[PDB]
Amino acid sequence: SGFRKMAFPSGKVEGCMVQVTCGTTTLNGLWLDDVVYCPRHVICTSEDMLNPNYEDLLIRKSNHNFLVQAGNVQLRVIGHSMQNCVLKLKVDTANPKTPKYKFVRIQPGQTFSVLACYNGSPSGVYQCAMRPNFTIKGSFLNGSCGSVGFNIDYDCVSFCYMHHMELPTGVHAGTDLEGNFYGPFVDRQTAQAAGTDTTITVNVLAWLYAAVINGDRWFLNRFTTTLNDFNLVAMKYNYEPLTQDHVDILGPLSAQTGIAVLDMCASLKELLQNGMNGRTILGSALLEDEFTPFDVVRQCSGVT
Amino acid sequence: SGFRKMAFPSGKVEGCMVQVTCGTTTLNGLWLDDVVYCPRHVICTSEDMLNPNYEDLLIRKSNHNFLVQAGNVQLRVIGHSMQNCVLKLKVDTANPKTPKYKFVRIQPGQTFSVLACYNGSPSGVYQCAMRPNFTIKGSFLNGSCGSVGFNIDYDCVSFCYMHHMELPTGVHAGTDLEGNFYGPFVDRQTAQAAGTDTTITVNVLAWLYAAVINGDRWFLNRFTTTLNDFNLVAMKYNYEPLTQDHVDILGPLSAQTGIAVLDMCASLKELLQNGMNGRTILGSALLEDEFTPFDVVRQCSGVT
Ligand SMILES: *CC(=O)N1CCN(S(=O)(=O)c2cccs2)CC1
Ligand SMILES: *CC(=O)N1CCN(S(=O)(=O)c2cccs2)CC1
């Protein structure tokens, strides 16, 4: 029993982290096979960051200007290219610790583990979600850029995020491993405001199911609702609209608990309208939205 | 910026997890040098668990009855001994992936990462604290026993916990790596009630400092207090008494923020007396007590 905000074991990703230095800028790279992936802004002076022309800046850079260090051993760079907002550094050595891997672009509401690194060295692991405004609420200091987000399916690491930016509001923006930003963000030190950070309704419902499974039941009520009625309430509380796709996705948790999804919706509706009245659910005084239905099933069944 | 509930990178501990089977009971072991550590209740049938006599049960067990599997390779057991509530299985092979390590017995209020495992395979990592009643609030299913808690100091893993028990209230009890239970708990399926789960005051203050550092300031007030006055309020709210040792420990966060510890105490006092009024601090509607002052400094400075 018990339900925790749980990250994937990070070992497979620890074995992929290196230090990239270009001039006086040091950040993290991901070493997979004979390619090191890092944020293209490694080539910038923080002056350049005001209005960088990355193609123009890159002309002035050679393979030997990219200093790649894996533990305390230097890798030889034999090639470099820009793909969107990431650099691919070709090195003469395949990472011997390359796990089975994919690059996936996740949807908003999807959760992932971050291995926070400084100078290519892991400092910690935590669980995130891609917010509906395509930000993440991370823990990232200067030097953390090139830290990656990932899911694991048994032996296969799916990389979904690389850290690039802190917005003025202290939320985070980054790319998939093809260098494409999540959301409308750009690797430029300019005015970038996030949109509405709405609550991930399907994740809140998943976590309400996790609470019932784990003995926290006080919030279960005698009511049901409809998707349309529930959605009026969600709109009013800046919750994401619930679709039949979400209802289908919660089917297994529905089955296990014998609580109809629309009944749990009616419970969530009362919690939005009445608040928690100083009570908690799985040790939280607010409705947690950074567990997917998949996360809840994984943790409640004990997948390795 | 940003502040997350952050676990140590788990790679060094992933490399230590094995499967121990005795008869029809499978749980996890920790392989360090040529010793595998696991919960002694591995030798029990769940019938035995009602009133086990472990010395008597152990007589009926030989080295060859302990099946130790590291990935998909069996280790040869050449010796076994009971130390308190753990078994030490001597194997003929040193774990090639043994990190630098210590066994430490932590104090209540101290935080640690748990690598949850099933059949010797890591499933997830999360951050815990030793509660003042010597329980932890974990995420542990059947098969998770022998999962370990740890801190890392650069290269040295300090093992502080091994998972043994779920209490009827769904909180967790376990041992240090010398097999001594935290608290008054015993590896017996009997009536064991936890004492008062008080709030770790010094940890709440550390997290209030982390909030100020990270731009969450609304709760800072114009008041100060004394240790004696603050402690009257703490007593009333089942918060741990604050000592001068705690004040000294918060000194660095005091210095960095320019907020006197006793001023931050007065802020905490108002939050206890007035509540959050529907506001949040670092994304939480309750006062977080599972970050130590050391954790806050580590995360806010970016130690690897
Ligand atoms: C994003 C990241 O981790 N970076 C880019 C900025 N540099 S830096 O310019 O060297 C700075 C260091 C402290 C303040 S800016 C660090 C790596
Ligand atoms: C604590 C732990 O992880 N254990 C001990 C109990 N066994 S068991 O008896 O095989 C059970 C499996 C499911 C219910 S009890 C599993 C390992």
Swiss-Prot record, chains A, B:
Changing L205V: In strain: Zeta/P.2. Residues 1-304 form the Peptidase C30 domain. The active site is at H41 (for 3cl-pro activity), C145 (nucleophile). It is found in: Host cytoplasm; Host Golgi apparatus; Host nucleus. Residues 1-304 are cytoplasmic. There is a cross-link at K5, K90 (Glycyl lysine isopeptide (Lys-Gly) (interchain with G-Cter in ubiquitin)). Changing Q189A: Does not affect ability to cleave and inactivate human TRMT1. Cleaves the C-terminus of replicase polyprotein at 11 sites. Recognizes substrates containing the core sequence [ILMVF]-Q-|-[SGACN]. Cleaves and inactivates human TRMT1, preventing tRNA guanine(26)-dimethylation of tRNAs. May cleave human NLRP1 in lung epithelial cells, thereby activating the NLRP1 inflammasome pathway. May cleave human GSDMD, triggering alternative GSDME-mediated epithelial cell death upon activation of the NLRP1 inflammasome, which may enhance the release interleukins 1B, 6, 16 and 18. Also able to bind an ADP-ribose-1''-phosphate (ADRP). 3CL-PRO exists as monomer and homodimer. Only the homodimer shows catalytic activity. Interacts with host FBXO22; this interaction promotes the proteasomal degradation of nsp5. This is 3C-like proteinase nsp5. It comes from Severe acute respiratory syndrome coronavirus 2 (2019-nCoV). The lineage of its organism: Viruses, Riboviria, Orthornavirae, Pisuviricota, Pisoniviricetes. The chain holds residues 3264 to 3567 of 7096 of the full protein.
